[PDB]
Amino acid sequence: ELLKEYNPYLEYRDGELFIEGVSLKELAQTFGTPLYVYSSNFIKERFEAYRKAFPDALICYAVKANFNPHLVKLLGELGAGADIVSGGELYLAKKAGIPPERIVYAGVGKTEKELTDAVDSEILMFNVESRQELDVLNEIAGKLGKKARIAIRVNPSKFGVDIREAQKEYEYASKLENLEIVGIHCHIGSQILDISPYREAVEKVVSLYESLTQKGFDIKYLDIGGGLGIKYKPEDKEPAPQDLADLLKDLLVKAKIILEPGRSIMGNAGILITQVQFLKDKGSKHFIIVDAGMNDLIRPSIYNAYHHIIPVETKEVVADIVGPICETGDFLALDREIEEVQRGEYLAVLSAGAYGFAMSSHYNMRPRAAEVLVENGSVKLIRKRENYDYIVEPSLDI
Amino acid sequence: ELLKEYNPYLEYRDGELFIEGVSLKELAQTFGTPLYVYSSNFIKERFEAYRKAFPDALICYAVKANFNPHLVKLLGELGAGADIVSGGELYLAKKAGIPPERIVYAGVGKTEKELTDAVDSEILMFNVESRQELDVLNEIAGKLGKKARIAIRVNPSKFGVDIREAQKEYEYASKLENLEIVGIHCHIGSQILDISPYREAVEKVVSLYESLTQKGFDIKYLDIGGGLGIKYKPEDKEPAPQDLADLLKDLLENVKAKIILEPGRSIMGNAGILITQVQFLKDKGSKHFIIVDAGMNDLIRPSIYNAYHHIIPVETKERKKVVADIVGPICETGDFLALDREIEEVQRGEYLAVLSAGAYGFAMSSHYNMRPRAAEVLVENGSVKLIRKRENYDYIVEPSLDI
DSSP states (O other): OHHHHHOTTEEEETTEEEETTEEHHHHHHHHOSSEEEEEHHHHHHHHHHHHHHSTTSEEEEEGGGOOOHHHHHHHHHTTOEEEESSHHHHHHHHHTTOOGGGEEEOSSOOOHHHHHHHHHHTOSEEEEOOHHHHHHHHHHHHHHTOOEEEEEEEEOOOSOEEGGGHHHHHHHHHTOTTEEEEEEEOOOOSSBSSOTHHHHHHHHHHHHHHHHHHTTOOOOEEEOOOOBOOOOSTTOOOOOHHHHHHHHTTTOOOSEEEEOOSHHHHGGGEEEEEEEEEEEEETTEEEEEESOOTTTOOHHHHHOOOOOEEESBOOOOEEEEEOSSSSTTOEEEEEEEOOOOOTTOEEEEOSOTTTTGGGOBOGGGOOOOEEEEEETTEEEEEEOOOOHHHHHGGGSOO | OHHHHHOTTEEEETTEEEETTEEHHHHHHHHOSSEEEEEHHHHHHHHHHHHHHSTTSEEEEEGGGOOOHHHHHHHHHTTOEEEESSHHHHHHHHHTTOOGGGEEEOSSOOOHHHHHHHHHTTOSEEEEOOHHHHHHHHHHHHHTTOOEEEEEEEEOOOSOEEGGGHHHHHHHHHTOTTEEEEEEEOOOOSSBSSOTHHHHHHHHHHHHHHHHHHTTOOOOEEEOOOOBOOOOSTTOOOOOHHHHHHHHHHHHTTOOSEEEEOOSHHHHGGGEEEEEEEEEEEEETTEEEEEESOOTTTOOHHHHHOOOOOEEESBOOSOOEEEEEEEOSSSSTTOEEEEEEEEEOOOTTOEEEEOSOTTTTGGGOBOGGGOOOOEEEEEETTEEEEEEOOOOHHHHHGGGTTO
8 A cells, every 4th residue: 555655654544644543633733734743663663674684784873864853862772873974963963872982974064173073072983075084183183182083985976085096095094193994985875766786886895895904904894875765756666674685795794884874764754744725726727835835845846856745634636736935946746646635634745754854944934843753642742843033043132 | 346246345455355344254263154244235225226216115125035133124224114925024024123014925925823913913915826815814804803905916836816817806806895905916036137027017017007997996006026136147237226217117107006116135135245164175086176164054046056156265365276166064965055166276274255145045044964054244334243143053953952
C-alpha cells in the first residue's frame, strides 16, 4: 500500500489519517498549522536498520538533515554518532549527549572559533577539505597542546580532492607535527536510489587505504559517507542499508567503517500538515492556497522537488498547490492530481523530515511551524511555534 | 565611477572601502562577519526620490524586501506607508509607528487570524487575490461590526485576476454588505529595468477605473504596485522614480484617484551590503575557490536564482585578478555567492563586500547547518547603530528548550 511504503506508521482509520496511532486532524486542531509531525519509531527503525546491516560500523547521524535537539538526542540514546558541519552542530551534538569520540566534522564551514572548539573537544576526526585547512588545524592544535585527528576527503565541486592526487595531501599532512592521520573519507552524493556507484567508489577508497597502509600510515577509520536515497515519488523504490552492505561486503578491511546517513533516517520520518485557505481559478488552471510555503519547506520551490501530498480526511482535480509567500515560485506542488479539497481541510505533505524545517526561514515575517513527536499514541511538543517577537528579538532593546 | 553607481556613499579611501565615512574593515573587526551593513542616507534619499517624483502619492514601503524594525521605523518617520503580505508585517509596520491608514495588504498570505487583525486594525485597503477571499473578508468584517476596504488585484502565477474579468469581481463585491470597494491594484513584476511595460499596464488600469466610475463605483485609490529595478550588474542602468513619473504623467492626468506605489527593492536593495571574511583558498583542477564565512544561509539569491551580486575587496592592494568561485560554509554544492568571477587575489583573513544585498537578503536568511544569522548595522554620516545583534546557537533552538 503506497502510504505505508512512505512510512509504515501512517494509516487511514475510517477516512482519517493517523500517525503512530494519533489523528493528524486532532494534531492540526490542537497544535495549529503549519505543523511538522515526526514518527519516533520510524526514526528508531531507520537507525536500527543501519546497525543491523553494519553491526561493527559507527553510524554518525548527519545533523544537517534536521537539527531539532530532541531528535538528535533520540538518535544519541541509540548510540548514534554525529556527522557535523558547523560549530552549531557540534553544540547540538554535545547538548544531545553524543560523546566527542563519535563526532566527525566535515565540510568547508570551519572558522577559527569553530575549529578551536572542535579540536579542544577532542572529536573523533576532521574530514579535511583543503590543504590550508590542514595548516590551520595544525596551528590550532599546537596552540592547545593537542593533536587534531584527520581524514582527507577524497572524490573517487568546492568539496574534496581527486582521489588520484590524495596521496600527496596525506604526505603533506604527515609533515605537520600536531596532526594525527587516522582516516579516509568520501561522500559521493545524495538521494542515491541506484546504489551501483558505491561499489566503484569504495573500491577506490580501499585501494587508497591499502596504498597508505603500505606507505606506513595508520588508517583507523574509513568514513564512506551518507547519501542513500529515500522514496519521494510513488514509483521510487528506495535502497535499504542491507542492500548497501550486500553491495560492499566483499570489498570490506581492518579499519572501522563510518557511515553518515541523514535523509535515510529523517526524510520519511516527518510530515508537514497544512490547512487549505482558498481555492481559485485562473482560466482553466486551478490553485489550492494553503498556510505553508517555501518558508516552511523550500525543496519544491528551489529544486523542483517532488513531495507526495495527501488529504488528512478522505472523501468522495489537477492543481498548483501553493503557499502564502509573496513569490510566484512559492509552491509545494505544480500540476498535481489530488482529490478535491475545501477551505479549512488539512493536507499532509510527505517526506518532509530531512532538509525541511532545517532550511525554513522567516521570509514575509512568517513564524516557523511547531514540531511534534509521536510515539505509539503519545505526543511530545519538540519545538514550539514561533511568534513575531522571536523573529525580531535580536533587534529589540539592543 | 562604478562603485558610486551602486551607492554614492561607497568609496575607497587609500585602498580601504568606506560607507558613509565608516570603514568596512573596522566594522568587520568590531562586529564580526558575516555582517549586513546599511546606509541610512541612501534609504532616506531613495524614499525621498519617490516623494519628489510623486508628491501627491502614498509611498508604501514593501516590507517583504527587509523586515528590520529600525529600518522600517526610519521610513515610517519619513511618512512611508507599508505594503504588507502577512500578519507579521502588520505587527512590524505597527511597531515601527506606521499608521493603518497608510497600510495596504496584498498576497494570498491571509489566514483567518491575519485577516481578523487587519480588519480590526482598520487598514487602508485589502488588495484582494480571490473571490473566496471576498466572501471570507466579508464574513470577518461582519463579525467585527466593521467594514473592510478593498481593491481587486488585476493583471493587465497564483496572483491577480485577468483585468478582462475584474469587472465581474467588482460587481460581485458590490453585493457584499461588509465590504467597501475603494481601489484597484496592479503589481506587474519585479526588477524591471526597462519601464516601458508600465505604460500599457497603467493604461489598462486607467481604462478599468473609467469604466468602474461610469458604473457608479467610487474608486478612491489606484495602487500601481512596485517593481522598479536596481543596478545589480556593472552594465545595468537603473530607472529613477522620476523616469516612471514622466512615463505616467499624462496617463494619470485622466484620474482623480490617489495613487499608491509599493517600492521595496528600489529603496532597500543597494542600501545594504554584506561583508564576509575569507576562510580558505583551494584549487581543484583548473578552478580557484575562495571560501568565505557567508553563504546561502545569509544571502540566498546567487544559489537559488543564479543572481548576480557585485563582489569587491574591502582592501584594494594592486594585485593580479583571478577567476574564482566565491563559495560559502554551507554543506551544499549549490552554496555559492559567485561563480567564475573576476576578483582581486585575496587571502585568508581578508574581507569582501557583496553589493546590492539590502533587499531579499537578510529577509531570506535561514539557520541551515545550525548557523546563527548575521549582525546588522546602520551607518549614518560617520557613526553607527547596531540594529540587529548577531544570533547565537541558543537562539536557533530556543523554542525547543524546556517545552
